[PDB]
Amino acid sequence: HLNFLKKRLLQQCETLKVPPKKMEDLTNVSSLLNMERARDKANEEGLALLQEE
Amino acid sequence: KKRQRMIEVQDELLRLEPQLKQLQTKYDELKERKSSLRNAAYFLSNLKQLYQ
């Protein structure tokens, strides 16, 4: 029964339609955020330094 | 935009930096000239009085 459920869900998700919006791999995105956050922090730091100057 | 701001502020600083020096030396030399010429006028008048 669970195999039939899985195959029907696979068919439904394959048939499902979405507007053309890019959506990156589920596992990696979180890591990217962390890096992005750090980037902003660094940028902010540099910005502060620039303003300080 | 902050990097451009860097560009204009550094340009203004490097332009204004030399401007102080010539004005300072001109002020100093003119003040020295004034003091020297006032002294010299005093001495020439005093020596003329001595001669008379």
From Swiss-Prot, chain A:
<comment type="subunit">
    <text>Component of the CENPA-CAD complex, composed of CENPI, CENPK, CENPL, CENPO, CENPP, CENPQ, CENPR and CENPS. The CENPA-CAD complex interacts with the CENPA-NAC complex, at least composed of CENPA, CENPC, CENPH, CENPM, CENPN, CENPT and CENPU.</text>
</comment>
<comment type="function">
    <text>Component of the CENPA-CAD (nucleosome distal) complex, a complex recruited to centromeres which is involved in assembly of kinetochore proteins, mitotic progression and chromosome segregation. May be involved in incorporation of newly synthesized CENPA into centromeres via its interaction with the CENPA-NAC complex. Plays an important role in chromosome congression and in the recruitment of CENP-O complex (which comprises CENPO, CENPP, CENPQ and CENPU), CENPE and PLK1 to the kinetochores.</text>
</comment>
<comment type="similarity">
    <text>Belongs to the CENP-Q/OKP1 family.</text>
</comment>
<protein>
    <recommendedName>
        <fullName>Centromere protein Q</fullName>
    </recommendedName>
</protein>
UniProtKB/Swiss-Prot annotation, chain B:
<comment type="similarity">
    <text>Belongs to the CENP-U/AME1 family.</text>
</comment>
<comment type="subunit">
    <text>Component of the CENPA-NAC complex, at least composed of CENPA, CENPC, CENPH, CENPM, CENPN, CENPT and CENPU. The CENPA-NAC complex interacts with the CENPA-CAD complex, composed of CENPI, CENPK, CENPL, CENPO, CENPP, CENPQ, CENPR and CENPS. Interacts with MLF1. Interacts with PLK1.</text>
</comment>
<feature type="coiled-coil region">
    <location>
        <begin position="1"/>
        <end position="42"/>
    </location>
</feature>
<protein>
    <recommendedName>
        <fullName>Centromere protein U</fullName>
    </recommendedName>
</protein>
<comment type="subunit">
    <text>(Microbial infection) Interacts with the N-terminal domain of Kaposi's sarcoma-associated herpesvirus latent nuclear antigen (LNA).</text>
</comment>
<comment type="function">
    <text>Component of the CENPA-NAC (nucleosome-associated) complex, a complex that plays a central role in assembly of kinetochore proteins, mitotic progression and chromosome segregation. The CENPA-NAC complex recruits the CENPA-CAD (nucleosome distal) complex and may be involved in incorporation of newly synthesized CENPA into centromeres. Plays an important role in the correct PLK1 localization to the mitotic kinetochores. A scaffold protein responsible for the initial recruitment and maintenance of the kinetochore PLK1 population until its degradation. Involved in transcriptional repression.</text>
</comment>
